[PDB]
Design a protein around this ligand. Structure first.
Ligand SMILES: O=C(C1CC1)N1CCN(c2ccc(F)cc2)CC1
Length: 185
């Protein structure tokens, strides 16, 4: 892929974070804390899952960023509508306003309804995410495997401003403490 030139500098929005998340001072890294992080509750925070949004909102153009997933057992990545549900239980699907992939129990899947099996030969340490707003496209790239395509959502109905979307995953196993990191341009 030749999408690198649409690179955007993403930062995390503390106010949207689940109350157990720890965001770095530079707002470029997030990890699961071992307890509540001593913040007040608000209507923006994801309540049920270890999720956070990027601060940036996109309503036009082409955007590209990269995320480091090194040594994580579980995570979700992609984009979502600014108006997605924050409280209670929900599935990651385009009908609910999410365009995502994930790792879970040694398999990679795209957040369609129902979910789609991904075919990844080289487990990725860094994921590239490309959004073309006008074309209605969200694509995922394996940076570890020379930028090979993972998945393309096409005919997307965004129906609003988009925000970068992250889920660090739970850490029941003790094997999923590692952070998500936004990689430098
Ligand atoms: O607990 C902490 C620090 C407070 C001590 N962590 C940050 C670095 N962690 C990490 C794990 C795997 C890995 F591949 C990269 C980073 C583990 C979680």
């Amino acid at each position: 892929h030749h999408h690198h030139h649409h690179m955007v500098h993403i930062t995390l929005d503390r106010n949207t974070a689940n109350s157990w998340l720890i965001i770095s001072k530079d707002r470029r890294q997030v990890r699961m804390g071992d307890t509540h992080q001593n913040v007040s509750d608000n209507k923006e925070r994801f309540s049920n899952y270890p999720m956070v949004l990027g601060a940036q909102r996109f309503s036009s153009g082409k955007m590209y960023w990269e995320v480091d997933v090194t040594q994580k057992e579980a995570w979700d990545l992609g984009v979502c509508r600014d108006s997605v549900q924050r409280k209670g239980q929900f599935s990651l699907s385009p009908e609910n306003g999410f365009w995502t992939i994930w790792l879970w129990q040694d398999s990679y899947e795209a957040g369609t309804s129902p979910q789609t099996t991904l075919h990844i030969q080289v487990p990725p340490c860094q994921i590239g995410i490309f959004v073309d707003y006008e074309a209605g496209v969200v694509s995922f790239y394996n940076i570890t495997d020379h930028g090979s395509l993972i998945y393309t959502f096409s005919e997307c109905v965004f129906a609003g401003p988009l925000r970068p979307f992250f889920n660090v995953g739970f850490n029941y196993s003790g094997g999923n403490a590692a952070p998500l990191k936004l990689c430098p341009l």
